[PDB]
Amino acid sequence: GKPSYQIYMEIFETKQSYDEVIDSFICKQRALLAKLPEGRHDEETELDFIYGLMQPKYRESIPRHEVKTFRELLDRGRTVERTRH
Amino acid sequence: KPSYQIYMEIFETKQSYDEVIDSFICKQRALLAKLPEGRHDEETELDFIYGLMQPKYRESIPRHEVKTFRELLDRGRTVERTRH
């Protein structure tokens, strides 16, 4: 297969692209996060991993400290995308 | 210190060419410790940084053969002593 350490390398090499939507990015990251050992990380941690990997428009507009879940994060990210076409 | 920036630093800080294992692990353990106490076990902290090492350490030290940083330092010193 593929060992935990290589997954972390993939997670942190998988940054959001300049035209990639938040729904796409979180799907991608959550799939990798699921290849990790079941029970290791809570959602707060999984959010910490990836928050800095989002594209700049989302980090400027969505303070990490205002989000507690992937649902809360997706909702604001879609909100971000729906205001600039 | 916001956990997500620490993680971004951890994985932005790969071991450089000719940087010895003590130098690299020092650096990372400093970052690993800025995280909330108790979040990660040592098995996880090794997984974080293991892929960040240079090829000679990974080529010679299988991740599955170390359980602690001390075991990692000891083999990493051995790798460096093979060329001294």
Residue numbers in the entry:
A (entry chain B): 4 to 88
B (entry chain A): 5 to 88
Copy text verbatim from the article accompanying this structure deposition:
Drosophila has two isoforms of Arc, dArc1 and dArc2, with low sequence similarity to mammalian Arc, but lacking a large N-terminal domain. Both dArc isoforms are related to the Ty3/gypsy retrotransposon capsid, consisting of N- and C-terminal lobes. As opposed to the corresponding mammalian Arc lobe domains, which are monomeric, the dArc lobes were all oligomeric in solution, indicating a strong propensity for homophilic interactions.
Each monomer consists of five helices in an orthogonal bundle fold, and the structures are highly similar to each other. Both interfaces contain four hydrogen bonds and four salt bridges. (D) A comparison of the dArc-CL crystal structures with the same domains in dArc capsids. Both the dArc1 and dArc2 C-lobes closely resemble their counterparts in the capsids, with an all-atom RMSD of 1.75 Å2 and 1.13 Å2, respectively. The dimer interface in dArc-CL, which corresponds to that in retroviral CA-CTD, contains mainly hydrophobic interactions; half of these hydrophobic residues are polar in the rat Arc-CL, and the first helix of the dArc-CL, a major part of the dimer interface, is tilted away in mArc, possibly explaining the monomeric state of mArc-CL in solution. The most conserved residue (Gln124 in dArc2) is structurally important, forming hydrogen bonds and contacts with many neighbours, including the conserved residues Phe133 and Met162. Kratky plots also indicate that dArc1-CL is more flexible than dArc2-CL.
